Amino acid sequence: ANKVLQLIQESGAKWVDFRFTDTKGKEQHVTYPADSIDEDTFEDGKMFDGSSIAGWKGIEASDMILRPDAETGFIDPFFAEPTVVVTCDVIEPSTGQGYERDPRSIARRAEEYLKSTGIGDTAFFGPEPEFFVFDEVKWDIDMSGARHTLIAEEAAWSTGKDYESGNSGHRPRVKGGYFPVPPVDSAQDMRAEMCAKIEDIMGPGRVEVHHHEVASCQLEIGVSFNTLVRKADEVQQFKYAVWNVAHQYAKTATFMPKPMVGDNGSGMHVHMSISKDGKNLFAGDEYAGLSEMALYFIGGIIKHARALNAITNPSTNSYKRLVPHFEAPIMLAYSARNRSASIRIPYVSNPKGKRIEARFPDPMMNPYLGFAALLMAGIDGIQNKIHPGEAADKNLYDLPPEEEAKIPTVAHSLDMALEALQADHEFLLKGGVFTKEMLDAYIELKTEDVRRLNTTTHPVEFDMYYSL
Amino acid sequence: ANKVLQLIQESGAKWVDFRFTDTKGKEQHVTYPADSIDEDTFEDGKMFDGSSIAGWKGIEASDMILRPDAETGFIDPFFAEPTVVVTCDVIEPSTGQGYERDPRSIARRAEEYLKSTGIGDTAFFGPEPEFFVFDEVKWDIDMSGARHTLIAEEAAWSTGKDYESGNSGHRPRVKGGYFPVPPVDSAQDMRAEMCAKIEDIMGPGRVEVHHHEVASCQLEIGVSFNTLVRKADEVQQFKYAVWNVAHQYAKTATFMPKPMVGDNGSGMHVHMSISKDGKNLFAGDEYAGLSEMALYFIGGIIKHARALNAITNPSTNSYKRLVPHFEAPIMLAYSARNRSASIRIPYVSNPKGKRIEARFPDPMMNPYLGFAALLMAGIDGIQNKIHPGEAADKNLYDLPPEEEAKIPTVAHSLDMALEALQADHEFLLKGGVFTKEMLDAYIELKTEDVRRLNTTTHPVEFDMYYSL
Amino acid sequence: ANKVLQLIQESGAKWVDFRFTDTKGKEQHVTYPADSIDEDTFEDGKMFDGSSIAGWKGIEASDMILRPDAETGFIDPFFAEPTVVVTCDVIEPSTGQGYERDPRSIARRAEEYLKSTGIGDTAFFGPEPEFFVFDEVKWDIDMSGARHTLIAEEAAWSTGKDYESGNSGHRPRVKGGYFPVPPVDSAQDMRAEMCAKIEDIMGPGRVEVHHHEVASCQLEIGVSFNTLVRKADEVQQFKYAVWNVAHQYAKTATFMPKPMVGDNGSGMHVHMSISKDGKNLFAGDEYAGLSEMALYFIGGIIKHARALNAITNPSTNSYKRLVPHFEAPIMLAYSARNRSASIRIPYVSNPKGKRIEARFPDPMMNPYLGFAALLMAGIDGIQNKIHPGEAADKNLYDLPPEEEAKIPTVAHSLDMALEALQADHEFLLKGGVFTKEMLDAYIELKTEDVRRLNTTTHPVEFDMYYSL
Ligand SMILES: [Mg+2]
Ligand SMILES: [Mg+2]
Ligand SMILES: [Mg+2]
Ligand SMILES: [Mg+2]
């Protein structure tokens, strides 16, 4: 590979880390010496067993090392070691979505199923994943019970706790960590290092902004928008960076939504634009400078949202975030200037950008699978000229004139989201981007997560039911 | 020795560590000054007493310092010190096996026997030994009772445990921990160091891959295939490297199978090939690119498997791995695409280097004895044109269509495996590779292991029987 | 029931504790009001569910309350509560062994089959169950490992231990503690109370002797022989008494064999006699006052012993006691004055008390199932005139003629015993005493015990295999 192989030469690296992504959206890695890696290897690939997506088949799939980009020197590890975050998973014959389905290939499929539709040359995604960093996190589940504890200095409740260096008393109050200065912020240099590591990985520029999110211990770093299968890869790399930098500060990072109860959850707003021969088609004048194309994109999403939630909100925990609150994207509507609207139109102040922002996804979403599903739903909108309705700007979450009551909402539970997907999977199967078998599997696999939650008695049930 | 003696000169080493292997397969060492090491030493050798090898009278035996491939530089000890990882153990009257039997000699024989039978000039072995690394391990047995505890940060059950740097929460789930990214992985750097040490010992290349195995705390490093004897020497060196690198990380490594219950045990798959005049004899068109030769090799293994188990699975603990879980390759048959198959045929993109994999051996095998046993049984197959029967491509396990009931299995216990060996030792005695006296000794010595287990009450015998 | 119902009247008891035994030989109980209990109850019985074994379509089975030999006025509980130590379990269709098979019924069956063959009117059992009493006992099995710890002041390894009232220094040495006087022997007083409670339960006399057994903390109380079924009921009652009296000393009792390794295990010798017209059939002038009948009884037992072991030694732990040692009745032969002999002929002085003693059974034996199986095997001997061979009181294992290898031994493992039973169940099936279905179930149930042991890594495996 021009990128990879040359990088190997320049780095004098002895080790090459093949990284791919599982159905649940967890990056995985296997490490090879540089000696085995040739240009032909990008074609031929390196083969391996299937133990996460598949089973029974005794599957001996191949890791077709993908080449352009994602050729990043492993910033954290000691020995010079580039990564190939680009490892599409191919069956032995039919060079295709390996195991049940390789997300990256599903996303590649969707890449083609946009030019093929002749709607657009490229699609651009700009996710805003939120994370929490804690000092330490502990949990256990037995017959004895279930228990989980968050530990952090910056935690709102840490006033009154004893510390080695002493307690500064300077910490964010609940919900009140929106940008206060460093005495209380107690991050900054960490975020900076995170940013520096990102730049090592993806490239120069790319990192837009770093700020403290509302909840105690909650941070946001902004990464530039990119095409799918690029941005998707970069999401995984972002996660990696923040995890490891935190670890170097003896702290732990989690992209889970609502880890903390009674403060803000972590959400992954997804900015979206479509381009054709380098013109953003979302530009127009229909709503606040939106093309009918964009309006159709919207509203396809609204139609298929509940089903989309399985993919965009694929964790039981996601629905802890999706509760009746303001700044909670629960209500399926669109408005540039309304919170609680599931969709927002960010003020581009210039027709060039014209993104649309979907606030309902959380970082638990498999980037590949998630971005793809949004597109499929989006284009179903355009194809079937699905009207997004009229933009509700006036009321976030307030009185019911029957209307807001009548307004559709996002899914209440993963259970429900999976039932939704069962009903409405057609748009995905378009272009053969999503095979039914994959969807079947996915749903069953995710159901085990649901099973866990539903089976395991919750501490709160003691509170409600113990003495009845 | 051109290698050794020259290395001594080049290293400016003051000491040479002579290493051999005991019956039980544990490398042993004695250290002599380099001044004592001349060319004549290689012929004459150095004298020493008899322990473990069951010497017992006629005690003074000799260490024929051999020449290993780049006789390891210290790679761990203080002074610069070469080790001659190879030191064939030679009897006072004559030259060959000492006391009951030197494994290395047994392996030297059988190298010859292949050529003697004229079926091939060279035999190729490529083991995949799995190991665990724990932070710490404790056990004790008294009259009071019998107790063992595994301690590790990366252990899946360590969520909720207290640590100095504080609990990261980032650790493998049970059976998960197949290739997650480093926050969870933890052992990247350590595996890398292990690899580096291996290369110090066995020189460049030689290291195929490093990944995290399924079980929490379980790691795999891939080492290149080699001839019998050489590969056996390299197995010992691999074990040594991983042990010591772990020790430098203040951790402990064990090659025992199933130390941890209810997650994967550690197994040593053995890739095997026969070559004659530098051509892969296993390549053909009989089954999935297999020569009749290979098919016959397979048959013999299958026939003698239970007896083979005494050598390939020579620990009571081995049989904790070899269980009805369809994961455990207990069923004696062959297929490229079947997990339950004791023997698997790996997909080779090119017919050169066609091999067969025996998944049933575990790292407790004394590689010398055992590479040997595989060959002897293999060639008995070829010699008697033993047909392996049909390949079980269809089904690993179903609602028992009888069939699976009728399917042959490996052995249930070391006890049984030793009984098996007693009955079926003939193939081994061919070539005089294995003396009866050696087998008789082996059996008795390993019986003491069985005695221990069967004599000592086990904690579970309290679970089941205490209140009865 | 004359006795039960009257007892209820006399006691002014408000409660009746209906007790039966499971396949595994553990007393079970349900407690019902005395108002619920009429004469009709003894005919009709009370219904209950089956989760114990033989999960059916549904297990509506009936507890035929069975007026015992002295239904116990009870002794431990506060409110006066008679127990009907007997409750045969009866199937709704018909009235026989419910579920797989009620042991008590199976035992009654064997009582009848004796008379059916006309060999004898009555069969007599006198078991000598040995137990340990410890101050406290702990164990746990996790992924972390396996542990178990025995704790007692009297334990021989407590010589150096710290005590509240201060260490006396006066305790049994290992194996010593065969009848030292009370300063060392902690159990006078406790054994006495145990005896007193037994008399409460089984009425006056009945208790023959109380002494300290060899091993530290090991005690023996002697209870008079009785008929099959009666004695099996009394076994259960004896266990109950000693358990609960110990609990009143804040201590714990276990009838498990070999709880403590490297001192004596706990064994249940079964003295056996047959009568017809109130005349001892065993008395004669064959050998040490034995009738040919008795000699034939012996033969059958010896013939079927390995299969008998499934019943007489039904715990994996049993084989910790049945280990090649002196004082360990592993050898299948008979003598008056020779140990090592599985069967012994006790010195009666006056015949009519002529018995045979089988020393190989342990207290894990289901008394009902055990007594039964011994009879069936015994009478198969008589029926087929199976010759016991020569009495081996010549010499112990002191002289191995190498024919000692050929000398038959009891089973080495529960696993083996179950394989034995599979092969040799015919004697049991005679008279329809034992259903095939019951035996088939039994075998499978006990296999789970074997599975446990074989699956769970033992502390000692760490000792042997960890650092290899
Ligand atoms: Mg934000
Ligand atoms: Mg935002
Ligand atoms: Mg006794
Ligand atoms: Mg006795």
Side-chain angles (χ1 to χ4, degrees), chain B residues 214-247:
Chain B
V214 258
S216 38
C217 315
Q218 204 180 25
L219 305 174
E220 197 163 22
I221 302 182
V223 59
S224 286
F225 74 106
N226 211 282
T227 77
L228 214 168
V229 169
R230 206 148 16 238
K231 199 58 234 168
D233 309 319
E234 293 160 54
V235 159
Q236 306 288 91
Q237 293 152 10
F238 175 74
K239 294 200 204 164
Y240 174 78
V242 337
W243 277 324
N244 292 249
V245 170
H247 197 15

Coordinates of all heavy atoms in Angstrom, one line a residue, chain B residues 214-247:
Chain B
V214 N -9.0 -15.6 23.8 CA -10.4 -15.3 24.2 C -10.5 -15.0 25.7 O -11.0 -13.9 26.0 CB -11.3 -16.5 23.9 CG1 -12.1 -16.2 22.6 CG2 -10.5 -17.8 23.7
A215 N -10.0 -15.9 26.6 CA -10.2 -15.8 28.0 C -9.5 -14.5 28.5 O -8.5 -14.1 28.0 CB -9.6 -17.0 28.7
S216 N -10.0 -13.9 29.6 CA -9.4 -12.8 30.3 C -8.0 -13.3 30.6 O -7.8 -14.4 31.0 CB -10.1 -12.4 31.5 OG -10.7 -13.5 32.2
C217 N -7.0 -12.4 30.5 CA -5.6 -12.7 30.8 C -4.9 -13.7 29.9 O -3.8 -14.2 30.2 CB -5.4 -13.3 32.2 SG -6.4 -12.5 33.5
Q218 N -5.5 -14.1 28.8 CA -4.9 -15.1 28.0 C -4.3 -14.5 26.7 O -5.0 -13.7 26.1 CB -6.0 -16.1 27.5 CG -5.5 -17.5 27.1 CD -6.5 -18.5 26.7 OE1 -7.6 -18.1 26.2 NE2 -6.2 -19.7 26.8
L219 N -3.1 -14.8 26.4 CA -2.3 -14.3 25.3 C -1.8 -15.3 24.4 O -1.5 -16.4 24.9 CB -1.2 -13.4 25.9 CG -1.6 -12.3 26.9 CD1 -0.4 -11.7 27.5 CD2 -2.5 -11.3 26.2
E220 N -1.6 -15.0 23.1 CA -1.0 -15.9 22.2 C 0.1 -15.1 21.4 O -0.2 -14.1 20.8 CB -2.0 -16.5 21.2 CG -1.6 -17.7 20.5 CD -2.7 -18.6 19.8 OE1 -3.8 -18.2 19.6 OE2 -2.3 -19.8 19.6
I221 N 1.3 -15.7 21.3 CA 2.3 -15.3 20.4 C 2.6 -16.4 19.4 O 2.8 -17.6 19.8 CB 3.6 -14.8 21.1 CG1 3.2 -13.7 22.1 CG2 4.7 -14.4 20.2 CD1 4.4 -13.1 22.8
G222 N 2.6 -16.1 18.1 CA 2.8 -17.0 17.0 C 4.3 -17.2 16.7 O 4.9 -16.2 16.4
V223 N 4.8 -18.4 16.7 CA 6.2 -18.7 16.4 C 6.3 -19.6 15.2 O 5.5 -20.5 15.0 CB 6.9 -19.2 17.7 CG1 6.3 -20.5 18.2 CG2 8.4 -19.3 17.5
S224 N 7.3 -19.3 14.3 CA 7.4 -20.0 13.1 C 7.6 -21.5 13.2 O 8.3 -21.9 14.2 CB 8.5 -19.5 12.2 OG 8.2 -18.2 11.7
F225 N 7.2 -22.3 12.3 CA 7.3 -23.7 12.3 C 8.7 -24.1 12.0 O 9.4 -23.3 11.4 CB 6.3 -24.4 11.3 CG 6.8 -24.2 9.8 CD1 7.3 -25.3 9.2 CD2 6.7 -23.0 9.2 CE1 7.7 -25.2 7.9 CE2 7.1 -22.9 7.9 CZ 7.6 -24.0 7.2
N226 N 9.1 -25.3 12.5 CA 10.5 -25.7 12.3 C 10.5 -27.3 12.3 O 9.4 -27.9 12.5 CB 11.4 -25.1 13.4 CG 12.8 -24.9 12.9 OD1 13.5 -25.9 12.8 ND2 13.2 -23.7 12.5
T227 N 11.6 -27.8 12.1 CA 11.8 -29.3 12.2 C 11.6 -29.7 13.7 O 11.8 -28.9 14.6 CB 13.2 -29.7 11.7 OG1 14.2 -29.4 12.6 CG2 13.5 -29.0 10.4
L228 N 11.3 -31.0 13.8 CA 11.3 -31.7 15.1 C 12.7 -31.4 15.8 O 13.7 -31.3 15.1 CB 11.1 -33.2 14.9 CG 10.3 -34.0 15.9 CD1 9.9 -35.4 15.4 CD2 11.1 -34.1 17.2
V229 N 12.7 -31.4 17.1 CA 14.0 -31.2 17.8 C 14.2 -29.7 17.8 O 14.2 -29.1 18.9 CB 15.2 -32.0 17.3 CG1 16.5 -31.4 18.0 CG2 15.2 -33.5 17.6
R230 N 14.4 -29.1 16.7 CA 14.6 -27.7 16.7 C 13.4 -27.0 17.2 O 13.5 -26.2 18.1 CB 15.0 -27.2 15.3 CG 15.8 -25.9 15.3 CD 16.8 -25.7 14.2 NE 16.6 -26.6 13.0 CZ 17.4 -27.5 12.5 NH1 18.7 -27.4 12.7 NH2 16.9 -28.6 11.9
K231 N 12.2 -27.4 16.7 CA 11.0 -26.7 17.2 C 10.8 -27.0 18.6 O 10.4 -26.1 19.4 CB 9.7 -27.2 16.4 CG 8.6 -26.2 16.5 CD 8.9 -24.8 16.1 CE 8.6 -23.8 17.2 NZ 9.0 -22.5 16.9
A232 N 11.1 -28.2 19.0 CA 11.0 -28.6 20.4 C 11.9 -27.7 21.3 O 11.4 -27.2 22.3 CB 11.3 -30.1 20.6
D233 N 13.1 -27.5 20.8 CA 14.0 -26.6 21.5 C 13.4 -25.2 21.6 O 13.4 -24.5 22.6 CB 15.4 -26.4 20.8 CG 16.1 -27.7 20.5 OD1 16.1 -28.6 21.4 OD2 16.8 -27.8 19.5
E234 N 12.8 -24.7 20.5 CA 12.2 -23.4 20.4 C 10.9 -23.3 21.3 O 10.6 -22.3 21.8 CB 11.8 -23.1 18.9 CG 13.0 -23.0 18.1 CD 12.7 -23.2 16.6 OE1 11.7 -22.5 16.2 OE2 13.2 -24.0 15.9
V235 N 10.2 -24.4 21.4 CA 9.1 -24.4 22.3 C 9.6 -24.0 23.7 O 9.1 -23.1 24.4 CB 8.3 -25.7 22.4 CG1 7.4 -25.8 23.6 CG2 7.4 -25.8 21.1
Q236 N 10.6 -24.7 24.2 CA 11.2 -24.5 25.5 C 11.6 -23.0 25.6 O 11.4 -22.4 26.6 CB 12.3 -25.5 25.8 CG 11.8 -26.9 25.6 CD 10.9 -27.5 26.7 OE1 9.6 -27.4 26.5 NE2 11.4 -28.0 27.8
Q237 N 12.2 -22.5 24.6 CA 12.7 -21.2 24.6 C 11.6 -20.2 24.7 O 11.7 -19.2 25.4 CB 13.5 -20.8 23.4 CG 14.9 -21.6 23.2 CD 15.2 -21.7 21.7 OE1 14.6 -21.1 20.9 NE2 16.1 -22.6 21.4
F238 N 10.5 -20.4 23.9 CA 9.3 -19.6 23.9 C 8.8 -19.5 25.4 O 8.7 -18.4 25.9 CB 8.3 -20.2 23.0 CG 6.9 -19.5 23.0 CD1 6.8 -18.2 22.4 CD2 5.8 -20.1 23.6 CE1 5.6 -17.6 22.4 CE2 4.6 -19.4 23.6 CZ 4.4 -18.2 23.0
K239 N 8.5 -20.7 26.0 CA 8.1 -20.7 27.3 C 9.0 -19.9 28.2 O 8.5 -19.0 28.9 CB 8.0 -22.1 27.9 CG 6.9 -23.0 27.3 CD 6.6 -24.2 28.2 CE 6.1 -25.4 27.4 NZ 6.1 -26.5 28.3
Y240 N 10.3 -20.1 28.1 CA 11.2 -19.4 28.9 C 11.0 -17.9 28.7 O 10.9 -17.1 29.7 CB 12.6 -19.8 28.6 CG 13.7 -19.0 29.2 CD1 14.1 -19.2 30.5 CD2 14.4 -18.0 28.5 CE1 15.1 -18.5 31.2 CE2 15.4 -17.3 29.1 CZ 15.8 -17.5 30.4 OH 16.8 -16.7 30.9
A241 N 11.0 -17.4 27.5 CA 10.9 -16.0 27.2 C 9.6 -15.4 27.9 O 9.7 -14.4 28.7 CB 10.8 -15.7 25.7
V242 N 8.5 -16.0 27.7 CA 7.2 -15.5 28.2 C 7.3 -15.5 29.7 O 6.9 -14.5 30.3 CB 5.9 -16.0 27.6 CG1 6.2 -16.7 26.3 CG2 5.2 -16.9 28.6
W243 N 7.7 -16.6 30.3 CA 7.8 -16.6 31.7 C 8.6 -15.4 32.2 O 8.1 -14.7 33.1 CB 8.5 -17.9 32.3 CG 7.6 -19.1 32.4 CD1 6.3 -19.1 32.7 CD2 8.0 -20.4 32.1 NE1 5.8 -20.4 32.6 CE2 6.9 -21.2 32.3 CE3 9.2 -21.0 31.7 CZ2 6.9 -22.6 32.1 CZ3 9.2 -22.3 31.5 CH2 8.1 -23.1 31.7
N244 N 9.8 -15.2 31.7 CA 10.7 -14.2 32.3 C 10.2 -12.8 32.0 O 10.3 -12.0 32.8 CB 12.1 -14.5 31.9 CG 12.7 -15.7 32.5 OD1 13.6 -15.7 33.3 ND2 12.2 -16.9 32.0
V245 N 9.7 -12.6 30.8 CA 9.2 -11.2 30.5 C 8.1 -10.8 31.5 O 8.1 -9.8 32.0 CB 8.8 -11.0 29.0 CG1 8.1 -9.7 28.8 CG2 9.9 -11.2 28.0
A246 N 7.2 -11.8 31.7 CA 6.1 -11.5 32.6 C 6.7 -11.2 34.0 O 6.2 -10.3 34.6 CB 5.3 -12.8 32.7
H247 N 7.7 -12.0 34.4 CA 8.3 -11.8 35.7 C 8.9 -10.3 35.8 O 8.8 -9.7 36.8 CB 9.4 -12.8 36.0 CG 9.8 -12.9 37.4 ND1 9.0 -12.4 38.4 CD2 10.9 -13.4 38.0 CE1 9.6 -12.6 39.6 NE2 10.7 -13.3 39.4

